[model samples]
Target: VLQKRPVIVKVLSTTKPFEYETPEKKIMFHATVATQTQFFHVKVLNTSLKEKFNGKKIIIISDYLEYDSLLEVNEESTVSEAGPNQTFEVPNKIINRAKETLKIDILHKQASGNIVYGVFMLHKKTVNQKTTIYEIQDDRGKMDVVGTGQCHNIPCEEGDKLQLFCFRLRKKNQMSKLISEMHSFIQIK
Candidate 1:
């Protein structure tokens, strides 16, 4: 079991809230919240409570699921926005370091625990195929990363800055690319 210590996390990005109906026609909302250290998928039960939490600082007072840096927030969880003056400032230099030093060749061999900071290019989404291919370019090289239904569906535009986490190497015979695993996710501005 993972411990729940209060960590002041600032939201980097969040997905557009989506809803699905249960047997009783209950509308259940789902959204992904990305941060510098981890990403979480939240379940909101109220139809009108689907407010976007991007670029905000939130504090969770209730217990929630935590596994491998990924979190699951339930409708019962107590979450509140931090005061305007009580936000966290993640180091810009740390993000730049993750972008500048990790080359494509190194990323191709890393099993996990890798981070990529790059600009977002157009992504190819294949519905029903459960796949999305994202073309990302960093300071040295450009590459395609495969995302899955299990991963967070990040909201992005062309040329937008992004940071990817926990993606591992995928090899198509002799060729190599990165694929987002169950715990892999994105952070963006």
Candidate 2:
């Protein structure tokens, strides 16, 4: 009998709050975490608009990595596989935030064909309507925050609309399957 031990994976903090504007009208909140192993899962919780936008569509813009040689962003299969530097961009929509949480799942496959998983979750209020950005590094059981301000300036309203982005990082060719997926929407309240 192959006994499987229950793995208690700690939640690594990659919570980053930022504004992006550069010859473009769109704004972004970006965060990244490097993994020791290849396969992992990630999730983001939108606590701010949960009551109003629960079940709405949450948009996923991009998934990137530092080691471009190891992973490829797969739009067709929604998986990151073996390839050179690649990027996938898609249209946006509404995401329901009724659950008050966004979930991101990432799977990493190693060179030796071993699979690993990691997860992350953050509240919406931690990074909204703020002038600075927050970032967390990949060292497990450790948390750090970095801020950036390089976005367009717009008037703020009480019930103005906002966007959500989700992404994952993984390794090459080991799964022959989708290692990551992006979802978006605005919930009906």
Candidate 3:
């Protein structure tokens, strides 16, 4: 017989930030990951005023995964936690596949105090050369890809590398008002 019991357990807090810098642009940002909660958040703050221009576009990307081996299975398949012991599974046979790392990219148009945010999830397929972005879901699990854009032909074998970038198109009148900030969060399974 199965017994239903209420047990009180201690909850561990887990949120850590990782810093990375771009060689060409010389921009720095923090990619934060919370293992205990299975969540990832990335924040990029523009430091260079000269990099700002008119009609400038910025792209921010982040990748997260377990250091050890992780398994991939069907989306319906249940996994333990978000760590080395936890395994990853794909939901769709033709589309969704298992991957070790989870990559995210945010594309935005930078303006003076006006910022637009877009979020995407990346998946790697064994047979396909391109990386696929899983459709973004709302709180009720409804898929939405209205504004999100997909980037095919990524030149990376695996998605372990996390990259964030910003591009300036035109010049601004004031240098002090040309900063951009972007951030994203993921839910822990």
Best candidate, TM-score: 1
List per-prediction Cα lDDT, in the order shown. 0.51, 0.24, 0.24
Report the Cα lDDT for residue 79, model 2. 18
Worst 10 residues of 2 by lDDT: 180-189
lDDT by residue for model 1 (46-80), tens: 43444434444454424555644345455544456
Q: Please identify model 2 stretches exceeding 4 Å from their true place.
A: 1-11, 37-189
Residue 131's lDDT in candidate 1: 69
What's the lDDT of the predicted structure labeled candidate 2?
0.24
Decreasing lDDT order of the candidates: 1, 2, 3
Q: List the residue pairs that clash in candidate 3.
A: 53-170, 54-170, 54-171, 72-88, 73-89, 73-90, 75-90, 75-91
In the range 1-189, model 3's lDDT, one tens digit per residue, is 111221111111222332322322233232222232233222323322112211122221222122112111122222122234333322333121211222222112223333222232323322234323323332333121111112222333333332322211122553311112222212222
Models ranked on TM-score: 1, 2, 3
lDDT for each residue of candidate 2 in 1-189, tens digit (9 for 90 to 100): 211222111122223433333334332222222222222223222223222212122222234221322222222212112123322222122111111222222222223222222223212212345332222222232111112233112222223333222322334444221121222111111
Residue 73, model 2: Cα distance from true site in angstroms: 7.9
lDDT of 3 at 165: 21
